[PDB]
Amino acid sequence: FPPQWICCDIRYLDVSILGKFAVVMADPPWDIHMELPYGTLTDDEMRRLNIPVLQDDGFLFLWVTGRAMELGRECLNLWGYERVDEIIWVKTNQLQRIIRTGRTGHWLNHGKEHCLVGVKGNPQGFNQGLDCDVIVAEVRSTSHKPDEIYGMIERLSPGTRKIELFGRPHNVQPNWITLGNQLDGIHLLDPDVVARFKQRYPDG
Amino acid sequence: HNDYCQHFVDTGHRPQNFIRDVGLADRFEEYPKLRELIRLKDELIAKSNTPPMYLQADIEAFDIRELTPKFDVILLEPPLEEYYRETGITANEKCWTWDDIMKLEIDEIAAPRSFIFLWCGSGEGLDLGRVCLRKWGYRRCEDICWIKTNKNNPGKTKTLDPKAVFQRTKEHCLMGIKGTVKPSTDGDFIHANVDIDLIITEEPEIGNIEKPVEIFHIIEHFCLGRRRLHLFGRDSTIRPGWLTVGPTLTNSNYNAETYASYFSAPNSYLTGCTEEIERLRPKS
Numbered sequence: 001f002p003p004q005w006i007c008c009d010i011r012y013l014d015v016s017i018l019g020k021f022a023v024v025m026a027d028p029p030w031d032i033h034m035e036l037p038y039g040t041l042t043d044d045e046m047r048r049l050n051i052p053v054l055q056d057d058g059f060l061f062l063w064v065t066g067r068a069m070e071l072g073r074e075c076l077n078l079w080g081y082e083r084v085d086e087i088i089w090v091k092t093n094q095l096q097r098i099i100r101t102g103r104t105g106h107w108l109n110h111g112k113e114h115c116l117v118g119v120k121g122n123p124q125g126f127n128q129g130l131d132c133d134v135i136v137a138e139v140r141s142t143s144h145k146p147d148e149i150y151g152m153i154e155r156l157s158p159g160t161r162k163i164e165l166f167g168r169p170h171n172v173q174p175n176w177i178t179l180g181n182q183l184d185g186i187h188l189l190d191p192d193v194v195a196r197f198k199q200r201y202p203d204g
Numbered sequence: 205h206n207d208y209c210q211h212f213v214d215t216g217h218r219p220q221n222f223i224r225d226v227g228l229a230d231r232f233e234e235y236p237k238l239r240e241l242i243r244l245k246d247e248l249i250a251k252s253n254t255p256p257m258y259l260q261a262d263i264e265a266f267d268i269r270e271l272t273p274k275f276d277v278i279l280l281e282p283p284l285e286e287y288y289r290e291t292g293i294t295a296n297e298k299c300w301t302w303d304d305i306m307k308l309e310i311d312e313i314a315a316p317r318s319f320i321f322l323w324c325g326s327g328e329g330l331d332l333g334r335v336c337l338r339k340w341g342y343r344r345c346e347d348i349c350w351i352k353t354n355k356n357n358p359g360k361t362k363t364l365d366p367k368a369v370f371q372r373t374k375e376h377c378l379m380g381i382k383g384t385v386k387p388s389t390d391g392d393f394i395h396a397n398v399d400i401d402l403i404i405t406e407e408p409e410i411g412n413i414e415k416p417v418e419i420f421h422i423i424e425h426f427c428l429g430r431r432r433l434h435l436f437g438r439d440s441t442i443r444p445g446w447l448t449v450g451p452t453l454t455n456s457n458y459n460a461e462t463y464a465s466y467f468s469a470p471n472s473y474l475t476g477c478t479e480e481i482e483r484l485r486p487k488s
Contacts, residue, residue, distance in 0.1 A: 059369065069344065073331065084367040086330055088349055088374065090402065096224045100231065100400050101238065103488050106387065107379065108346045108426065109400040117369060126369070129362060133326075133370040134351055136208050136219035148209045155213065156369065 001161070001190055003172035007183035010165050011045055016053045017196040018177060022123065022160035023153050024054050025061040027145050029166065032066035043071055051079040054163055057121030061087075061153065063145050064114050072116050081118030088112040089135040089146050096136075113145060123157075130155045142168070150176075216358040218373055220351045226404035228418060241484040242425070245398065249424045252475040253445035254466045259458035262451050263435065264298065268308065271449065273464045274315035276393075276429020276473065279419065280305075280322045281436040284329060287413050290364050290372075297452055302332035308435075310340040317383030317393065319427055321348070323415060326372040327365045333378050342380030350375045350416055352407045377419060388488060392474055397486040398425045414440065428475045431467055 006013065031040040051060070060081050064072035076083055090112050093099050104110045130152075137146040150173055153162065164171055167178035177193075188194045198204070208219035225231050232239035259271075282300040310320065320342050324333035337344050351374045354361075363372045387396035399422040408414060420443060423432070434441060437448035447463060467473040 069347065070334065073334075082367070083331060085370050085372070086376075087370065088351075090220065090223065090351065092223060096222055098223060098226075098400060098402060101486075103397040103486050105346065105397070105401065107381070107394070107396050108348070108422070109397050111400040111402040112349060114347070119367070119369070128369055129360070129371050130213060131209055131370055132212055132218050132373045134218065134220050134373050136223060148207055151207060152209055152370075 002174055003176060003178070004188050004190065004193070005167070005169075005172050005178040005180075005183045006186050006188070007181060008179055009181055010049060010179060011041070013179065014200055015050050015179075017200050018054065018163060018193060019161070019190075019196075020056055020058075021054050021163045021177075022058040022126075022157045023061065023162040024051060024058070024165070025149070025153070025162070026051075026165040027063040027167075030065065030068040030071065032068060034066075046071070046075055047078055049075075049079075049165075051075075055120050057123040058119075058160075059123065059126075059153075059157070060116075060118040060120065061149065062116040062118065064116055069114065076116060076118045079118075079120075081120050083116055084119050085117035085133055087115040087117060087133045087135060087149070087152075089115070089137060089149075092136055092138055094138060115145070115149070125160070126157050127155060141170075143170075216354070216360055218352075218354050218358075220373065220404055221353045221355050221358075223353075223404055228421070237484070241398070241481070244478065244481050244484070245395070245425050246421075248475055248478065248481060249445060252430060254430065254447075254463070256442045256444050256446065256448070257458050257463055258437070258442050258448040258453055259456045260451065260453040261449050263308070263449065264300075264304065268310070269312050270460070271313050271433065271447070272460050273431060273467060273473075274318070275313055275431045275433045276315050276318050277423050277427050277432045278310060278314060278318070278320045279423060279432070279434045279437075280308075280310070280320060281415060281434070282323070283413070283436060284323075284325050286325045286327055286329070286365070290326075291410060291413075293411055293413075302329065302336070306332075306336050306339055308340075311382075313433070314340070314342075314382050315429065315431065317385050318429065319382070319423075320380040321419065321423055322378045322380065324376045324378050326363075326375055327368070330376055330378075333376075337378065337380040340380075340382075342382050344378055345381045346379035346401050348377040348379060348401045348403065348419065348422065350377065350403045350405070350419075353404065354407050356406060375415075377415075391482075391487070392428060392477070394427055395425060395477075395481075395485050420446070428477070430473055430475055 029040045167180040285299040288295045403418045432446045434448045
């Protein structure tokens, strides 16, 4: 299924219309208890996201930083997952070197971003051990996480339907449905999803 | 597409194999003033270091309160069964469960403001090590990842943990803080932002459980406290500036009165600092 997306607020969309997915991924605007140039969701707003409806069996990829190392683990547990891996994205400059200088963390400098990997239920049809848990990539444009994750997930769970929360227009991919408040309108191709959408949102 | 993940799938070269200039020497070879900050800080550490002290002890059956005075930094390296499961090796010593580790009374020997560095492995320890930090009265505040390259033997490595979904190629050393410390105003206790939270080295030879020596450099650069304890160290990790305590040590020289005397008057438990380092170190 080609790319699909819904421009929406993740807190308020009825995601039960979307069916089940083999993989959920989210890169949320955590409240990391500091002034940021972007708006965040409260801890309680994150806890209450209706992640449980999206999957019965499958995987969750949850990007975390700062105090969300712990809050994200709590969310994984609240949403019904067990953490079974932790991917790190090692950020390199244009010459494949880590940028070691500046003040990029509170105590030590920061050379990586973390992504929790959770499992729910008893998935099948996945491929263990094809990729490593270390991604090495430059920071590209507005990217908050590296595009390499989509290929790792596809090799892990080929051909299955996947959903990304807090996604951006750059992130739309085949087999993915992308939700986020900066997407361009609503674009749904799956006939079973369009049917439930207009049943739930008759006026569009 | 310069996708090193795809490249690993195709060739067995881990993505971290393509990070350049990760060694202690070559990282700042082209940056004389970055190199100078590290050189001067290492000189300050060496000038103020206690001679090595070490104690053989069965830590499971040891009153940890026998170690005095209080410690500014504690490096904790309990032998996890996963270190041996994932490599296939039979352990020569008692392996520690996370229940065993949690029972340690680390809060009884930590200074009121102090830091801990806990080697947690790659699996359940990332979660249970956090519980341990809570139990001992620390807040998790950084995560130093030891990323292992396989430049010398490219290929895949099967992770034995049946819950794993990816090939595990790193270990996590969780950093915890006890007490109140502010990087901008407590510069006589910490030099923040001198090191990054990554150590990159080649996979050790089979049978070698050692952790990368760079972890000591990160700790020593970061905290100016001179009272440094390495729990579950070995003969091979004994180091000036450190008290090493562990079951496999072959000899002991620790004397609690002598050790404490190195930090009491006319000495200080802090290294102090030079004006040259103060002018070079990162400050905000």
